[PDB]
Amino acid sequence: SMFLPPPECPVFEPSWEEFADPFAFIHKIRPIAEQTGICKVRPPPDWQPPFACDVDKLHFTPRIQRLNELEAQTRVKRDYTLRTFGEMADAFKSDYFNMPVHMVPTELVEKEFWRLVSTIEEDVTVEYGADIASKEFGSGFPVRDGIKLSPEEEEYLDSGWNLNNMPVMEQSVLAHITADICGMKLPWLYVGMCFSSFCWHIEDHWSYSINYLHWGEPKTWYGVPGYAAEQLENVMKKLAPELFVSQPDLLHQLVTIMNPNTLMTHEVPVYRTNQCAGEFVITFPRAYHSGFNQGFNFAEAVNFCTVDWLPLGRQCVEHYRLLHRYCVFSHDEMICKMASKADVLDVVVASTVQKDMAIMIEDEKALRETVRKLGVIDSERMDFELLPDDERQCVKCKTTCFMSAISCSCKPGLLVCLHHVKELCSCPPYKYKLRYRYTLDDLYPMMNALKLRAES
Ligand SMILES: [Mn+2]
Ligand SMILES: [Mn+2]
Ligand SMILES: [Zn+2]
Ligand SMILES: [Zn+2]
C-alpha cells in the first residue's frame, strides 16, 4: 503493498512577462515553494527550445543501480550510445509490465517502484547516465560554437532558462567565483530508464537546483521543505545508521532510497510531482529530494545561488564544520572576491554581499581576539586562494580555510581553522603562527566599496 501518494507540490504557469526573469520569478514564488521544498514550472506554451541530437554519436558509460530501500548508495562524480541505451530501456519496461512502453500508468510505475525497493525477494537492477556536459555528450540546450546555429537556436542561446546561462547571470552569486568548482557551475546530463533513481539528498552548500526534462517519459519527484531537513535526518538516522558514519571525502558520500510514507508517518512533510518533458523542477535551499524515472528520458540540471541564499550558504559552512564535512568552495573567499569586484556588481547583489561581509568581519575579529588570548602572537599574511583545496583544510573539521588558519613549524603544511587551535600539535601556542588573508584594516574599505556601489 500500500502506497499513499504524498500531496502534490505547487505548479506554476508564468506568463511571458513573469517568465522573462528567472531570478525575479524564483524570488516571487519563494514564499510558497520554500514551504514544499520543490515546485514545478511550466513555461509559456511558445517557449520551446530546439532539441536536436544524433543518437548514434552520443556515447556514455552507465552506472549500475540495485533498487533496495535503506541500502547505502554512493553519490558519484559497459558503454552505450543514446540509441542502444534507449533500446535496452524500452525493452526492460515493456518486459517488466508485458505492456507497450507508453501504456504503463504512472501511478502503477510509482506503486511498483515502492513495492520492488521494499521486497527482499526482488533483485531488480537498472542503469542510468549521469555526467557534466563534454564533447562525447553535450548540453541539451543551444550553446555558442566556432558550427553555424539556426535562428531557432539563436533565440534560446541567451535565455535565462537555458541552463548554461543561469550560473553566469548578474542575479547569481556563483558567477564571479574564480575557483575550479566544475560540479556546481556546469550543467549535469541525466539519461534515465524505468526505475532509475536519485536517492534522498540536499545540494552542496544548500544551493538551489533547476532541472529541465528535455524529452521522454516523466520523472517522479518527492520533496521536503528546508525547515524539515533535521526532522528528516533524525528519521533516517534511526532507520539507517550506517549512512551517518564519517566519510574520508566528498567522493564517499552515502545516500539512500526511503519511502515517503515512512517520512509522512514520522510527521515529516513530503510533496510529490511527475515532471513531464518541457517542464522544470526547482529545488529550494536545504530541501531534501529523491525520485525515479517512469521510463527512457533525458534531463539537464544545474545548481545556482541567489542573494536570498547568501546567509544560508554561511549557515551551511558552519554546519559542515560541526559535522567535519568537506566544502566544495570557501564561502568567505567567494564573498571577498565579490567585494574586490564591487564596481561591476549588481546593486542588490552588492547590498546583500555587504551584509554577509559585516557578519564575516565581526566573527573574524572575535576569533582572532580569542586565539591571541591563547598565546598565539606571531602572524604572517598568506594568500590562501593560491593553495589547492586539499592543502588548506582544517586537520580537525575539514573546513576550507581562507580568512585565517594556525600553523606550526613542527607540522609542515598542516593547518587548523581558528576554532581548532588546540588540535594542531602539542607545542605551546607561542610556537604558532597566525596565517591571515587580510588585516581588519584591509577588510573595512572592501566592505565600504560595496556600500558605495549599493547606494548608487
Ligand atoms: Mn528489492
Ligand atoms: Mn539534487
Ligand atoms: Zn608544533
Ligand atoms: Zn576547524
Swiss-Prot record:
UniProt zinc finger (C5HC2) residues: 394-446
Residues noted as binding 2-oxoglutarate in the record, renumbered to the chain: 128, 209, 211, 219
Residues of the JmjN domain: 9-50
Signal peptide from the UniProt entry: none
Subcellular location: Nucleus
Tissue: Ubiquitously expressed, with highest levels in testis. Down-regulated in melanoma and glioblastoma. Up-regulated in breast cancer (at protein level).
Domain JmjC residues, every copy: 155-321
Domain of life of the organism encoding this protein: Eukaryota
Comment text on domains: Both the JmjC domain and the JmjN domain are required for enzymatic activity. However ARID and PHD-type 1 domain are not required for activity per se but contributed to recognition of the H3(1-21)K4me2 substrate peptide.
Family the UniProt entry places it in: Belongs to the JARID1 histone demethylase family.
Subunit composition and interactions: Interacts with FOXG1B, PAX9, MYC, MYCN and RB1. Interacts with HDAC1, HDAC4, HDAC5 and HDAC7. Interacts (via PHD-type 1 zinc finger) with histone H3 unmodified at 'Lys-4'; the interaction is inhibited when histone H3 is methylated at 'Arg-2' or 'Lys-4'.
Function: Histone demethylase that demethylates 'Lys-4' of histone H3, thereby playing a central role in histone code. Does not demethylate histone H3 'Lys-9' or H3 'Lys-27'. Demethylates trimethylated, dimethylated and monomethylated H3 'Lys-4'. Acts as a transcriptional corepressor for FOXG1B and PAX9. Favors the proliferation of breast cancer cells by repressing tumor suppressor genes such as BRCA1 and HOXA5. In contrast, may act as a tumor suppressor for melanoma. Represses the CLOCK-BMAL1 heterodimer-mediated transcriptional activation of the core clock component PER2.
Protein name (database record): Lysine-specific demethylase 5B
